[PDB]
């Protein structure tokens, strides 16, 4: 931006853990901030803006905010 310096991604569908603890849950159109300079085998690690929860999640469930 111009008065900010934090990378983000924006979600495009909801996500759930089902049978796990280390998985970050969310909805469509949510905002998540990155915690690693690269992904791990398709999994990203991030912190949600609304929930402030952390965990692994599928990078493909999100897109670069500024397309």
């Amino acid at each position: 931006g111009s008065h900010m310096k934090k990378q983000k991604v924006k979600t495009i569908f909801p996500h759930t853990a089902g049978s796990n603890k280390t998985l970050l849950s969310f909805a469509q159109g949510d905002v998540i901030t990155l915690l690693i300079p690269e992904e791990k085998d398709g999994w990203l690690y991030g912190e949600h803006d609304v929930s402030k929860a952390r965990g692994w999640f599928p990078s493909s469930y999100t897109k670069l905010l500024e397309e």
Binding site: I12, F13, T22, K40, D41, G42, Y45, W56, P58, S59
Partner: peptide, 17 residues
């Protein structure tokens, strides 16, 4: 410290128009 990754690859969104 970042927690360990799972033993399987990450899933994908639905394939739609």
């Amino acid at each position: 410290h970042i927690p360990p990754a799972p033993n399987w690859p990450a899933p994908t969104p639905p394939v739609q128009n």
